[PDB]
Ligand binder design. Structure first.
Ligand code: 0KE
Ligand code: 0KE
Lengths: 428, 422
C-alpha cells in the first residue's frame, strides 16, 4: 500500500520552505549559532509583555517575559513540540494505534496541530481530491465537509445510515459495482476514501458500533480506500465505556483521524490535530506552511500549559464534568420533545455530541417553517436541507442543539415548534 | 470590472454556511441552531495581559474570546482596520456599489492565508501570472503547485522596471484580455516596500506606470505589503490601493512585522466580490481567525488609539533603521571588495551578491552552518531554485551589531577560502 495513488499531483510536488530546510541543518551544526536567516520580528519590540490566565480548578497559567516573546513569535508549521509530544502520548494511551512503530514509508503514526479540526479536514480533502474522484459518506453529514467537498468536483456517493451510523450492508452493495482488483487500476475510479463522524454524527447524534467499524474497516482494506475519521465529539460520548476508534484498529495505515479541542476546551482558540500515516501528515504540514504558516503560538502554549498541569488524570476529570453537563442537557431536550413533540415528530436518544435530529411527521419541507415562521417567533434551529449534498431538495428534518439553552428555553422553543407544525398540518 | 474572469468555477461554486444564511434572515430569542460549546464549560476564566498599561478579559470577554466568531473577523477589529485603510490610503473604491468592487476587508490568519486564498480563487492550471524575481519564497511555493506559468518581470534598485512589464505585455494586444483563449495575465504580484529578499521599494512614478499597464491589459494587482510600516525613507510612497480607481487591487497587510507574528493576524483589502470569495474559502478551511488573538489586538488598539499605534510604528521604524545601519557597517568592514549590496529602502533584509562565486548554496548550506552562522541562499527566491545563485539574504531584524560583525567576519573568511583556490 503506497500513498501515491490517493494524493493529487499538486500535493506530491509541494516542497518545504527554505527555513524548514535550514531548521534540519540547524540541528546538524554547533551550539554557538548566529542567525541572520529569518524575517522574524525582533522579540523585544512586541507590545505585549506578560500574561496571567485563570483556570477554574487548576493552577493559574503564567507567561513570563521570555515565554511571552516565544508566544508572540513564529513557530513550527506542525505545532510546538511540547503540545505535539503530549498529544502523541494521548493518542497512544487512548487508541494504541498499530502504526506507532511502523517505518515512516509504511505509514508510521504522525501528528500535526491544525487551526481547528476544520483545517485538518480541508487540507486532507485538497491533498486527495482530483475532479471526478469518487468519495463515500453517509448523509445527513456535517455541512462544513459538504461545502469543502462540493467545489473540489468529486462525486459524493451516499452510504445508508440508521440509529447505529453507516449500515455496512449499504457500503458492501455500493462497492459491489467494482471488483476488489479495480483499486489497482486508476481508470476504474474506485473510491478514494470513506468519510465518517463515528461519535454523535453532525447532525444525527448517532454513533457507530465496534462491530460495524470492524466491518467498514474490512471493506476499506478489500477495496483499498482511506478512512477519514472526523471525531470532534469523541470526548462527548454519553454511553458507558468508549467504543474503539478506526485509528485503534488501523493495521494498514489507512486511517486519517481529525480531533478537536473546540467541543471540550475552546472553539475560539482554533486548535485541533490530525493523526495519520507519516507520508500523508507530511503533505498536510506542507500545505499548512503555505496557507496559515502555523497555528497560533500563543493559543498552543495556553493549551499546552493547561494540558501539562492537568496530566492525563486532570484532562479526563474535565471530560467527565463536560459529559455530565451535556448528558443533563440531552435529558432536558428529550423531556421538552416528549412534552410538546409526541405525535408530531420522530426522534431517538443521541449517543454523543450536542444535537437532537427530529423528523417532522407530515411535512415534506421544513425550510419555510424554520426559516420564516420560527424566526418571526424568536426560535432558531437548522433545517435538514443544510446537511445533504442536494440542499435544494425538501427535508422533513431539523437539527436542534442542546449545548447552551436552558431546560425552560427548550420548553418554550418546542412549544413554539409544536404550535407552528400543528398550524402547517391543519392547512388543507 | 468583470470579476468573473478572475474567479475559478470552484471559487464561484462556493456558498455561505447555513449559520451565515440563518443570521442574515434575523431582524428575545432562543437559539438551538449552532454547534457551539457551552460558554460556561471553558477551563480559562479571565486574563490579564501587560502592555505599564494592562489589557483585561473579564469573565464575559473571556467566554467570547474562547468561542466561535464570524469568518471575516470580529466587527470591532474590522471597523478599526477599515478606518485605518481609509485614513492611510483613502481608496477610490470606498463608496462604489458592491458589484463595481466596493472596498471590503477581512481578517486572515496572517497575510500568508490571504495570499494563498487569493491565488486559489484566481488560478486555473496554465494561467499566466506576472511577478519580479527574486520574490518571497512563500508565494513561489504557493503558486508552483497551482500549475500557473510564472512570467518574470525585470526589477532594479527601485523595484519592477515598467519598461520590462511593457515589453512582456507587448506579446498580446490590449483587446486580447476580452478573449479567454488568448490567455492574458490574470495578475501582477508585488511586494512594493522592502521586497523579500531584495529590500528594494517601488517609487510613486513606477506604481502609476504599472497601474496604467494593469488597466490597459486588464489584470489585477496583488499588493503584498507586510513591510509597509517598516519604511526607512521620509514620507511614505502612495500604495497601489490609494490609486485603485478601477477596483483591480487586492492588498495584503500583516501585523506580523509590527505587532506579533505568532498571533497569526493579517488582513486583506480589495473589491467586495473578490473579498467575498476569500471569506467563503476561509469558512471551509480555518472557520475564522482566533477570537482570542483578535480580541488581544482589538483591546490593544482600543487602549492605544490611532496615536499609540502610530507612536509604536515610529519606535519600530527607529529600531530597524538602527539595525539596518549596524548590518551596513558590518558589511562595509568585512565584505568590501568581496561582495555587492546597496541600502535597503524598507523591511528587515540585506541582499548581498558574492563577487566571484557562481553558486553560494554550498557556502551557506554547508560551510556557514558548520561555522555557526545562518543565512539564506538566493536559490530559495527564484522559480528555478535549482539554478546557481551568487546571492544571499541576511536579515537584520534580531541579531545584535556585534553578532553581525562576527557573522560577516565568518562570511568574509568563507568567501576568501572559496576564491583563493585556483
Ligand atoms: C521560522 O522562520 C520564519 C518564519 C516565518 C517567516 C516569514 C517571512 N515572511 C513573511 C511574509 C509574508 C507572510 O507573513 P505573515 O503575514 O506572517 O503570514 C507575506 N509576504 C511577505 C513578502 C513575507 O515576507 C520570512 O521572510 N521569514 O524568513 C520567515 C522565517
Ligand atoms: C457560529 O456558529 C457556528 C460556528 C461553528 C460551528 C461548528 C460546528 N461543527 C464543527 C465541526 C468540525 C469543525 O470544528 P473545529 O474543530 O472547531 O474546526 C468538524 N467536524 C464536525 C463534524 C463538526 O461538527 C457546527 O456544527 N456548528 O453549528 C457551528 C456553528
Amino acid at each position: 500500500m503506497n500513498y501515491a495513488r490517493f494524493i493529487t499531483a499538486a500535493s506530491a510536488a509541494r516542497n518545504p520552505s527554505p527555513i524548514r530546510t535550514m531548521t534540519d541543518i540547524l540541528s546538524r551544526g554547533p551550539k554557538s549559532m548566529i542567525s541572520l536567516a529569518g524575517g522574524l520580528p525582533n522579540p523585544n519590540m512586541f507590545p505585549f509583555k506578560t500574561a496571567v490566565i485563570t483556570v477554574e480548578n487548576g493552577k493559574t497559567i503564567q507567561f513570563g517575559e521570555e515565554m511571552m516573546k516565544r508566544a508572540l513569535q513564529y513557530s513550527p508549521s506542525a505545532g510546538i513540540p511540547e503540545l505535539l509530544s503530549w498529544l502523541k502520548q494521548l493518542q497512544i494511551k487512548l487508541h494504541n494505534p498499530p502504526t506507532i512503530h511502523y517505518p515512516p514509508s509504511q505509514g508510521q503514526m504522525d501528528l500535526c496541530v491544525t487551526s481547528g479540526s476544520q483545517q485538518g479536514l480541508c487540507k486532507v480533502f485538497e491533498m486527495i481530491i482530483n475532479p471526478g474522484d469518487n468519495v463515500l459518506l453517509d448523509e445527513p453529514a456535517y455541512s462544513g465537509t459538504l461545502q469543502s467537498l462540493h467545489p473540489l468536483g468529486c462525486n459524493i456517493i451516499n452510504v445508508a445510515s440508521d440509529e447505529s451510523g453507516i449500515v455496512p450492508d449499504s457500503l458492501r452493495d455500493i462497492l459491489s459495482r467494482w471488483k476488489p482488483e479495480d483499486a489497482k487500476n486508476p481508470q476504474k475510479n474506485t473510491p478514494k476514501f470513506l468519510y465518517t463522524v463515528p461519535n454523535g454524527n453532525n447532525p444525527t447524534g448517532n454513533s457507530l458500533t465496534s462491530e460495524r467499524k470492524k466491518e467498514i474497516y474490512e471493506l476499506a482494506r478489500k477495496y483499498d480506500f482511506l478512512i477519514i475519521e472526523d471525531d470532534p465529539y469523541y470526548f462527548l460520548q454519553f454511553n458507558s465505556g468508549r467504543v474503539p476508534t478506526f485509528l485503534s484498529m488501523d493495521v494498514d495505515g489507512r486511517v486519517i483521524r481529525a480531533d478537536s479541542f473546540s467541543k471540550i476546551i475552546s472553539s475560539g482558540l482554533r486548535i485541533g490535530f490530525l493523526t495519520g500515516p507519516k507520508p500523508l501528515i507530511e503533505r498536510v504540514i506542507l500545505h499548512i506552511q503555505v496557507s496559515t504558516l502555523h497555528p497560533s503560538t500563543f493559543n498552543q502554549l495556553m493549551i499546552s500549559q493547561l494540558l501539562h498541569e492537568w496530566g492525563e488524570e486532570g484532562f479526563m476529570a474535565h471530560v467527565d464534568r463536560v459529559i455530565d453537563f451535556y448528558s443533563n442537557q440531552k435529558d432536558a431536550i428529550l423531556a421538552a420533545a416528549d412534552k410538546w413533540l409526541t405525535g408530531l415528530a420522530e426522534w431517538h436518544v443521541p449517543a454523543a455530541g450536542m444535537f437532537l435530529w427530529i423528523k417532522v411527521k407530515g411535512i415534506n419541507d421544513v425550510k419555510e417553517l424554520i426559516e420564516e415562521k420560527a424566526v418571526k417567533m424568536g426560535v432558531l434551529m437548522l433545517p435538514g436541507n443544510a446537511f445533504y449534498v442536494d440542499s435544494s431538495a425538501p427535508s422533513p428534518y431539523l437539527r436542534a442543539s442542546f449545548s447552551s439553552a436552558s431546560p425552560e428555553q427548550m420548553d418554550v422553543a418546542f412549544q413554539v415548534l409544536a404550535q407552528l407544525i400543528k398550524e402547517s398540518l391543519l392547512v388543507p
